[PDB]
């Protein structure tokens, strides 16, 4: 229960942070960069993280 | 005939604070002020207030200094601040009602055609609300003395729309006790109601003892009402009431029994799930 | 300028601002909520976007 409620308090606290965009991968290249489309706006390249 | 009146937390706390002022200022034992609200329909909404310099002598009871000039000045002043606020009544911090009250209520009625008096008990209690609502009605004494200007009780309660709710419950949460536990809260309600009924009947018994001893005159009207109450008391061992009682209690217990089955089955399901999950986990740590 | 869409509870209304986004906002008290109704136009404020004045 304590974990649940701590989670709730933090959830309220830091939901002020903005979310994320959903992009359609179009092409990939060297780990440094990978292409992706960000609907509705045009197609770009992104610097992927360490996933 | 203003059947229903709703006081508001803001006016309540303001009255409390002003009474605290007066207590610090001196020893007056009672205080008076004006009550502003919008008389929506035949249901008054006393939604603000402000005190008025008042005083009286403990002996004469015909001496006081309610300041009508001050009254009008600030009634208009608060009208300026906000419009939908034209006097509807007046509050006094008297643990019990006074004779002065009828004359003061007439004075206030001079401004409000249908003015409402309210008693706010700064001193605490544990039976009902800290407020009482009265209206100066005149009724003919069917027998004997002529009609007199006497106060009459009206259904008084308390409410807040949303903002006062937020403020009050915030301060409560800051210093309060457990909230509605459903079963717990409503059983507490049952017991509190029993306590209130007991206190009220203690009061009526005390008055009856005073009359029986002859400390005050017999009021055939109050008698009439009391024997009406007793005449209204029911019969339980009626042998029809009891059969119906058992029958419907049986239905209540049937539903509760099935609901208990629901609870038990769900708990058992939870136990099965937890047991199997824990067994699989410990098997994993085994391998 | 935007037209209200639904009387959401009492102090809540869904209004589709002409620029395209749709918002939910509360209305100043002195607006006679009965007046505004699905399809009525209103003038929301810059910052908070509370319904200030209904328009024909």
């Amino acid at each position: 229960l304590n974990a649940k409620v701590r989670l709730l308090r933090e959830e309220l606290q830091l939901l002020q942070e903005q979310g994320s965009y959903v992009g359609e991968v179009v092409r990939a290249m060297d780990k440094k960069k990978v292409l992706v489309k960000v609907h509705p706006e045009g197609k770009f390249v992104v610097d992927v993280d360490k996933n | 005939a203003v059947q229903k009146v709703v006081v508001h937390p803001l006016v309540l706390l303001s009255v409390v604070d002003h009474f605290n002022r007066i207590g610090k200022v001196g020893n007056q034992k009672r205080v008076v002020g004006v009550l502003l609200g919008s008389w929506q329909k035949k249901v008054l909404d006393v939604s603000n207030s402000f005190a008025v310099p008042f005083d009286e002598d403990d002996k004469d009871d015909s001496v006081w200094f309610l300041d009508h000039d001050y009254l009008e000045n600030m009634y208009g002043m608060f009208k300026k601040v906000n419009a939908r606020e034209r006097i509807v009544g007046w509050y006094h911090t008297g643990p019990k009602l006074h004779k002065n009250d009828i004359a003061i209520n007439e004075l206030m009625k001079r401004y409000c055609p249908n003015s409402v008096l309210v008693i706010i008990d700064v001193k605490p209690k544990d039976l009902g609300l800290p407020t009482e609502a009265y209206i100066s009605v005149e009724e003919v004494h069917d027998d004997g003395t002529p009609t007199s200007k006497t106060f009459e009780h009206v259904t008084s309660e308390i409410g807040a729309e949303e903002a006062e709710e937020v403020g009050v419950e915030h301060l409560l949460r800051d210093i309060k006790d457990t909230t509605v536990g459903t079963l717990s809260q409503r059983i507490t309600n049952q017991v509190h109601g029993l306590k209130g009924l007991n206190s009220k009947l203690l009061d009526i018994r005390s008055y009856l003892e005073k009359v029986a001893t002859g400390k005050l005159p017999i009021n055939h009207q109050i008698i009439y009402q009391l024997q009406d109450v007793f005449n209204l008391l029911p019969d339980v061992s009626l042998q029809e009431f009891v059969k119906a009682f058992y029958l419907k209690t049986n239905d209540q217990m049937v539903v509760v029994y099935l609901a208990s089955l629901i609870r038990s089955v769900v708990a058992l399901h939870n136990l099965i799930n937890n047991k199997i999950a824990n067994r699989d986990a410990e098997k994993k740590e085994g391998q | 300028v935007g037209e209200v869409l639904k009387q959401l509870t009492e102090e809540k209304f869904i209004v589709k601002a002409t620029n395209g986004p749709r918002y939910v906002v509360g209305c100043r008290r002195q607006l006679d909520k009965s007046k505004l109704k699905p399809g009525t136009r209103v003038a929301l404020d810059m910052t908070t976007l509370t319904i200030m004045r209904y328009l024909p």
Partner: protein
Amino acid sequence: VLESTMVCVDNSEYMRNGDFLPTRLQAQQDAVNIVCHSKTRSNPENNVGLITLANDCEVLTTLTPDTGRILSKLHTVQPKGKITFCTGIRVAHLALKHRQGKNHKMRIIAFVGSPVEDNEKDLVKLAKRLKKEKVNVDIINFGEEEVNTEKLTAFVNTLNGKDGTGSHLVTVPPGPSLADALISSPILAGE
């Protein structure tokens, strides 16, 4: 001087009388007018208030430095009932107590032309209370030059003690309007 002045005025059925030209009520109107003008010519901030003495000893205007409202309200009055006094004086004292300007010295003046049906012992006790509460009283009596003059003299002596000159008595015999006496009265002569 900074002065908060309460003024009580009788309106008993005897004030239906007209021994004072033109009539008793109009003599009272003249007296209030002259007193208000004198107070205004005194320190302007000085404040005034009004009470009528009747079966229920009502109050007309609370403290205010104005005199227009004073006289206007006082005009809408008719003599009725009998003076209740005592209660009137107590109400006036409470009025003086609840005065915004505390610095202002507390002064009551009572137009009491009538027969006073009061116990002199309670008069004396009230005198004690008021003197200990530090308020000075001035009485203007007309008519009952014999019925209550001794009582009021005793009351004023009580208030004065040995030095309380602030207390004052002015009893006027039958005659013209109650103007010349007031203007050439000690209460306003000192002013």
